[PDB]
RNA sequence: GAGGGCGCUUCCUAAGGUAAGACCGAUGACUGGGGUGAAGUCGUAACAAGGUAGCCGUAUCGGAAGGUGCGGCUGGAUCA
């Protein structure tokens, strides 16, 4: 898979914070999108 | 002689002490919860049949979201 992340906050430190946490929650979205190649 | 102040004790008796509380405030080592703020860190849950739909009352096991089970209802689905 390929997935980029050009996102924002007010602070660049807060963009590193909330956007890399957004990468964590993206992999949380990518659990069944990765692991569950069976949906049944 | 009567009566009279004083003569003359007591009654109630103001205050002070006692004891055994109760009330109410202040106060307090450490400590339980809650709210606020970071943007640490743990996590996939709750949201779509939101990734095991849940949601209750209840018992019980988790660091924690939570789980297991008793029974009930859609404020639930593909449509059963």
Residues A33 and A26: their CA atoms lie apart, in Å, by 10
Q: Give A1-40 as a DSSP string.
A: ---------SSHHHHHHHHHHHHHHHHHHTTTTTT-S---
Long-range pairs of A30-36 with CB within 8 A, sequence gap ≥ 24: A30/A1, A34/A1
A5: its two tokens: 């992340």
C1' of B2 to CA of A35 (Å): 131
Residues A23 and A14: their CA atoms lie apart, in Å, by 14
Experimentally, the structure was elucidated by cryo-EM
* Strand B nucleotides with an atom less than 7 Å from a protein beta carbon: 39-45, 50-51
Q: Which nucleotide has the least CA–C1' distance to A25?
A: B44
**Could you tell me the resolution of this structure in angstroms?**
5.6
CB distance A22 to A7 below 8 Å: yes
Residues A19 and A10: their CA atoms lie apart, in Å, by 12
CB distance A17 to A10 below 8 Å: no
CB distance A5 to A24 below 8 Å: no
CB distance A19 to A3 below 8 Å: no
The residue with tokens 């990518």 is A30
């Amino acid at each position: 898979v390929t997935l980029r992340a050009e996102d924002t906050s007010q602070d660049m430190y807060s963009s590193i914070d909330f956007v890399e946490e957004k990468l964590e929650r993206q992999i949380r979205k990518y659990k069944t999108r990765m692991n569950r190649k069976p949906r049944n």
